[PDB]
C-alpha cells in the first residue's frame, strides 16, 4: 500500500498524504470519543459498523475540500468530517434495515446481530450525535446539515415509491449527492476557503455522491462481498432497480424475457438473485451505465478543474477516478 | 375512533383564560401543518398521516401553559417551541410503530401497516430534519435542548427493548426508562415553554423538573390504558406490550403476586405472545391482578410528587391550568 494512498485514493505525495491521513485520522478520534459517550445501552450497538471498516469515502472529501482553503487543519474541519460521516453511518443502520441486508462492512449488520428495533435506534441515536455536534459549527452549518438530511431522506423514500430512468437520477442525486455535497460546502467554510471554492466543491461534491452511487449499483452486480463487504444482488433481492437493471430491462435478447420475469419484484430465491447477476453482469445495460458513470466522472473533472494548481485539486481529481473504478 | 385534544378535555379555567390557551395551542398546529405540507410531493402523504388522523396535542398544551408561567407567553417563539417538540414526538410516533408492529395509530391505519416499515422508518427520519431546521430558528441553546432531549428519548427506547444485566429492581429500571423515554421530551416542552416566554431560571427548571414527573404519569397512564382501555377510546389496539412482551408496570406487579392466576398470566407473559386470544386472556388477568392496584398507587404517588412540583410555580392561571392537565395525565382512557 502506497505511502501516497489514503482510503484508497493515491493523493500523489507522501507529505500531502500524511496530511491528509493525519486529518482524517482526527475525524476518527472525534466520531470514536462522541460514541464512545453514550450510555452503556447504547455502546455496543453504536460501536458495530463504526468498529467493522467503511472507506471514510466522506471524511476523505471533507478533509480534501479543506485542503483548498488556508486553514486545512481548523479544529472545525474536524467537526465537519464527524457529522457527516455520523451522519451517513446513521443512514447505514436505517438503510441495512429497510435493505434486509445481512452483511455490512463484511461483518453482520446491526440488523441480523441487534434486530431492526436496536438498529432503528442506533441510526436515530447517531442522528442526535450529528445534531449535538454540528451545533458546534454555528446557525448556518446547522441549517445545511438539516437540509442535506432532509434530502437524503427524500430520495431514500422517492426510492421506496418507486422503472424510470429520469427518478433514479433524481433518487442518486438526493440520497448520495446531497451529503458529499455538504461535505464539499463545509469542508470549504471551515478551511476558510472563498465563498467561489465554497460553491463550486458543493457542486463537486454533488456530482461526485450522484457518480458513488452509481459505482455502488454496479459494485451490486459486478463485486462479490469478498471485495464490497456486502451481498451482490440485494438490489435484485429487494426489488430496487438501479441504473445498470433499468438500462438492461430496456434491452431485447434471447436472455431478457428471463431476466425480465426474474426482476419483476422482490427476489426472495438466492438461486433466482444469481441467475439475475449473470443476466446483468453479460447485459449491455452494464456497460450503458458504465458510461453514465463516465459522464458524470466527467462533470466533476469539469468543476474541480476551476479549484486553484494546489495539491486538493490533484487529490480531488484522484478521488473522482476512484469513486468510478472502485470494487467496494 | 380516538381521544379528543387535551385542550378539549380539561377546565383551562376562566374563559379569559381558555381563550389565550387555545389560541396558543392552534398556532403551535397552524406551524406544523405548514411545516409539513412544504416538504417534497414524495412526502407529503407520509409525512400528514398521523398529524391529520388525530392525538391529543397533550405536548404543545404541555408547552403553552408552560409558556403562561412567562410575562411573554405568546411569544413567536414559544409557537415555534411547541411545534419542534410535537414533530419530535410525532417523529417517535412512526418509529415505536414499526418497533412495536402496532397497526393502528390515532384510530387510523399505523403509517406502517399503510406503507409498510420502509415509508414509516423515512417518514420518522424526515420529522427529525424539520424538527432540527424549526429548532434552529430558537438559537444554539435551544438547538443543544433539543439533540439532548431526543438522545436521551432513544436512549430509553433502546433500554426499554435492550432490557438490562444490571442489579436493578424491575419497577426501578422500569421507572429509569418511561422517565427517558417520555419524561425527557415533556420536561423539554416546560424547559423551552419557560425559556421563550421569558420565565425566571428557576421556574424555567421547575418546568423542566414539572415535565418529568408528568412525563412519568403519563407514561404509566398509558401502560394502563394498554391494558384497560378499547380501541375506542385510546385509538390503538389494546394489549400490544403484552403481544411484544414489554413489561409494564401493572405486569411487574401483577408477576410477584402468588397463586394460580400470577402462574397463568406468567406463562402468558413467558414472551411475545401471537395468539389474539392469549392476549385477551393476559388482559382479563392484568384488569383483575392486585398488581394493577399497586401501579395505580404508583401514578398516584407521581400525580401526587406534580402537585408538589407545580406547586412551586407562582399562583397564576397558568398553574392551575397545569393542575388540571396533571389530573388529565393520571384520570385519561386514551
Ligand atoms: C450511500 C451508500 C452507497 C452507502 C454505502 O456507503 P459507502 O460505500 O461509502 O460505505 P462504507 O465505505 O462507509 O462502508
Ligand atoms: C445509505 C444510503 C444513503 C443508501 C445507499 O443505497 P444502497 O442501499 O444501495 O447502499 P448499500 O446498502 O448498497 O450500501
Ligand atoms: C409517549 C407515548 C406514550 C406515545 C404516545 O403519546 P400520546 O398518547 O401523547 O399520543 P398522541 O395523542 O400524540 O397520538
Ligand atoms: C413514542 C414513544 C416514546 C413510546 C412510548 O411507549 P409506547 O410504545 O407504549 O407508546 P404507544 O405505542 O403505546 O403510544
Ligand atoms: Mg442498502
Ligand atoms: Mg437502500
Ligand atoms: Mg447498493
Ligand atoms: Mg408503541
Ligand atoms: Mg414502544
Ligand atoms: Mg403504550
Same mark, same amino acid.
Given at each position: 500500500?502506497?505511502?501516497?494512498? *489514503?482510503?484508497?485514493?493515491?493523493?500523489?505525495? !507522501?507529505?500531502?498524504?500524511?496530511?491528509?491521513?493525519?486529518?482524517?485520522?482526527?475525524?476518527?478520534?472525534?466520531?470514536?470519543?462522541?460514541?464512545?459517550?453514550?450510555?452503556? *445501552?447504547?455502546? #455496543?450497538?453504536?460501536?458495530?459498523?463504526?468498529?467493522?471498516?467503511?472507506? /471514510?469515502?466522506?471524511? =476523505?472529501?471533507?478533509?480534501?475540500?479543506?485542503?483548498?482553503?488556508? %486553514?486545512?487543519?481548523?479544529?472545525?474541519?474536524?467537526? !465537519?468530517?464527524? *457529522?457527516?460521516?455520523?451522519?451517513?453511518?446513521?443512514?447505514? &443502520?436505517?438503510?441495512?434495515?429497510? #435493505?434486509?441486508?445481512?452483511?455490512?462492512?463484511?461483518?453482520?449488520?446491526?440488523?441480523?446481530?441487534?434486530?431492526?428495533?436496536?438498529?432503528?435506534?442506533?441510526? #436515530?441515536?447517531?442522528?442526535?450525535?450529528?445534531?449535538?455536534?454540528?451545533? /458546534?459549527?454555528?446557525?448556518?452549518?446547522?441549517?445545511?446539515?438539516?437540509?442535506?438530511?432532509? %434530502?437524503?431522506?427524500?430520495?431514500?423514500?422517492?426510492?421506496?415509491?418507486?422503472?424510470?430512468?429520469?427518478? &433514479?437520477?433524481?433518487?442518486?442525486?438526493?440520497?448520495?449527492?446531497?451529503?458529499?455535497?455538504?461535505?464539499?460546502? =463545509?469542508?470549504?467554510?471551515?478551511?476558510?476557503?472563498?465563498?467561489?471554492?465554497?460553491?463550486?466543491?458543493?457542486?463537486?461534491?454533488?456530482?461526485?455522491?450522484?457518480?458513488?452511487?452509481?459505482? #455502488?449499483?454496479?459494485?451490486?452486480?459486478?463485486?462479490?462481498?469478498?471485495?464490497?463487504?456486502?451481498?451482490?444482488?440485494?438490489?435484485?433481492?429487494?426489488?430496487?432497480?438501479? =441504473?445498470?437493471?433499468?438500462?438492461?430491462?430496456?434491452?431485447?435478447?434471447?436472455?431478457?424475457?428471463?431476466?425480465?420475469? =426474474?426482476?419483476?419484484?422482490?427476489?426472495?430465491?438466492?438461486?433466482?438473485?444469481?441467475?439475475?447477476?449473470?443476466?446483468?453482469?453479460?447485459?449491455?445495460?452494464? !456497460?450503458?451505465?458504465?458510461? *453514465?458513470? !463516465?459522464? &458524470?466522472?466527467? %462533470?466533476?473533472?469539469?468543476?474541480?478543474?476551476?479549484?486553484?494548481?494546489?495539491?486538493?485539486?490533484?487529490?480531488?481529481?484522484?478521488?473522482?477516478? &476512484?469513486?468510478?473504478? /472502485?470494487?467496494?
Amino acid at each position: 500500500t502506497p505511502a501516497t494512498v *489514503v482510503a484508497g485514493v493515491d493523493l500523489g505525495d !507522501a507529505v500531502f498524504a500524511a496530511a491528509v491521513r493525519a486529518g482524517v485520522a482526527r475525524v476518527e478520534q472525534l466520531m470514536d470519543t462522541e460514541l464512545r459517550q453514550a450510555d452503556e *445501552v447504547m455502546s #455496543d450497538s453504536l460501536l458495530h459498523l463504526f468498529n467493522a471498516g467503511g472507506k /471514510r469515502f466522506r471524511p =476523505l472529501f471533507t478533509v480534501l475540500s479543506a485542503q483548498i482553503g488556508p %486553514q486545512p487543519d481548523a479544529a472545525a474541519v474536524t467537526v !465537519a468530517g464527524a *457529522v457527516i460521516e455520523m451522519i451517513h453511518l446513521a443512514t447505514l &443502520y436505517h438503510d441495512d434495515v429497510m #435493505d434486509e441486508a445481512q452483511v455490512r462492512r463484511g461483518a453482520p449488520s446491526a440488523n441480523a446481530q441487534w434486530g431492526n428495533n436496536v438498529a432503528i435506534l442506533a441510526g #436515530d441515536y447517531l442522528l442526535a450525535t450529528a445534531s449535538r455536534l454540528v451545533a /458546534r459549527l454555528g446557525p448556518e452549518a446547522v441549517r445545511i446539515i438539516a437540509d442535506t438530511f432532509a %434530502q437524503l431522506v427524500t430520495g431514500q423514500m422517492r426510492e421506496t415509491r418507486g422503472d424510470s430512468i429520469e427518478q &433514479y437520477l433524481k433518487v442518486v442525486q438526493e440520497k448520495t449527492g446531497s451529503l458529499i455535497g455538504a461535505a464539499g460546502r =463545509l469542508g470549504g467554510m471551515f478551511s476558510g476557503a472563498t465563498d467561489e471554492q465554497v460553491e463550486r466543491l458543493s457542486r463537486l461534491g454533488g456530482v461526485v455522491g450522484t457518480a458513488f452511487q452509481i459505482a #455502488d449499483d454496479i459494485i451490486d452486480i459486478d463485486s462479490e462481498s469478498d471485495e464490497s463487504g456486502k451481498l451482490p444482488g440485494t438490489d435484485v433481492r429487494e426489488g430496487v432497480h438501479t =441504473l445498470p437493471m433499468l438500462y438492461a430491462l430496456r434491452e431485447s435478447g434471447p436472455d431478457c424475457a428471463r431476466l425480465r420475469a =426474474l426482476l419483476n419484484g422482490p427476489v426472495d430465491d438466492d438461486a433466482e438473485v444469481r441467475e439475475a447477476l449473470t443476466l446483468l453482469r453479460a447485459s449491455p445495460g452494464m !456497460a450503458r451505465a458504465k458510461d *453514465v458513470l !463516465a459522464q &458524470y466522472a466527467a %462533470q466533476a473533472r469539469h468543476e474541480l478543474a476551476l479549484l486553484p494548481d494546489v495539491p486538493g485539486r490533484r487529490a480531488l481529481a484522484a478521488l473522482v477516478d &476512484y469513486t468510478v473504478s /472502485r470494487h467496494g
